[PDB]
Symmetry: C2
Subunit: 242 residues, 2 copies
């Protein structure tokens, strides 16, 4: 359900990018309410969300690897690794150049799946608003777990998902000697289609089966898709940038 | 105006912490709308906001000082300082305790005013959800500008403000040679009463006048209070406790 100003948007024709149509159909048909001040905001969400999808695929293809925090590394042209495994943007380096380098020199990087999600958000935002506006607003950067600079992010409960969502597979009876498998953050790329950093681009069964193989002795509870979604607050983000 | 589960909340008696009644009454009477899925959820917001106010006051009295990023320091028992000026939680230090140390050993810390706001949010959250839930969720921490570990924070346009809001005094024609005076992030502690890291607890006039004394030659634009509020998203946070 899409509401622009206070008018409900029904099947009302438009000359927009085709690859946006599937998402827009989801957002119109869903019971979930999307409120916008304007069409430009809605258009920003559509493009940002499909750019999140594209960026996840870009990261997947990049050659960047999975590593635990203590094994994390990056291109020292742009990033310093803290002892705890944070990737710190070096003094006065351009944020967009440094973040895009992850895509362009993937082999020089390895990091965690949460870190990968934030990276994907930044890559998508850069693709959406351009290097100049991104650098102006998100001018200091450290990539580390779920740290982000200024981004307005929220997580909500429910079973209705949309392309570009960040979702989570929980593995409740994971093997305690392998806490790395307690669950998996993913980007929703398509119907039953996920980006999962370190695992690849897989469907749900694949992810759940993989998780289920690293459970404790005698474990009976299967891994499963949590009913929640982590999302960028587009009106708030629109405000910062545009 | 408070609406809970689709029902308006008008004056209705309750057995709650007196400390919360002013804010509650303020949030009922105002024309702006607050929506909750439960009473528990509203109670969380009242407590969280009053804890933000208390935390600002705590930081004020702690002895923690203002410093630029390049001059930022912290208690090295808990925090390492990156070259760029980030305060990085040391490997396997308890997050709640490291953050609380800012209040308990204030003179060992100096940091910038965005960093200060984030610290106040963490201090308030610990007070609101307790150390166990805090440490379970916010298990990795770097204090640096507007970096957040999982915090759901957004900024909206408006001119109706409430206790615990984060506001901004802008200095459009600040002296380019004194960039720290670009503006001042504040927490609203009461009517025309602000916590301003590095300035103290001041009214609006005092902050504007202070800012105005660090403007370029011949400046005809006064520093002024922006029509915006920075806020924690309660439903995202409330997920944690229920």
């Amino acid at each position: 359900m899409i509401i622009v100003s206070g008018q409900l948007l029904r099947p009302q024709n438009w000359q927009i990018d085709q690859d946006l149509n599937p998402l827009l159909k989801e957002m119109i048909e869903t019971p979930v309410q999307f409120d916008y001040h304007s069409i430009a905001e809605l258009m920003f969400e559509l493009k940002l969300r499909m750019n999140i999808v594209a960026a996840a695929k870009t990261l997947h293809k990049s050659g960047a690897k999975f590593a635990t925090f203590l094994k994390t590394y990056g291109n020292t042209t742009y990033w310093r690794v803290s002892p705890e495994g944070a990737l710190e943007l070096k003094y006065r380096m351009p944020p967009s150049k440094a973040i895009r380098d992850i895509a362009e020199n993937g082999p020089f990087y390895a990091f965690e799946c949460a870190t990968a999600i934030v990276i994907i958000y930044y890559l998508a935002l850069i693709d959406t608003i351009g290097e100049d506006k991104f650098n102006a607003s998100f001018d200091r950067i450290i990539l580390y777990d779920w740290h982000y600079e200024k981004l307005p992010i929220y997580t909500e409960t429910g079973h209705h998902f949309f392309l570009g969502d960040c979702l989570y597979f929980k593995n409740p009876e994971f093997d305690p000697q392998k806490a790395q498998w307690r669950g998996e953050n993913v980007i929703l790329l398509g119907e039953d289609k996920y980006f999962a950093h370190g695992l690849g681009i897989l469907n749900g069964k694949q992810i759940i089966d993989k998780l289920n193989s690293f459970r404790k002795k005698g474990a009976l509870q299967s891994a499963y898709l949590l009913s929640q979604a982590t999302r960028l607050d587009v009106p708030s983000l629109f405000r910062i940038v545009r």
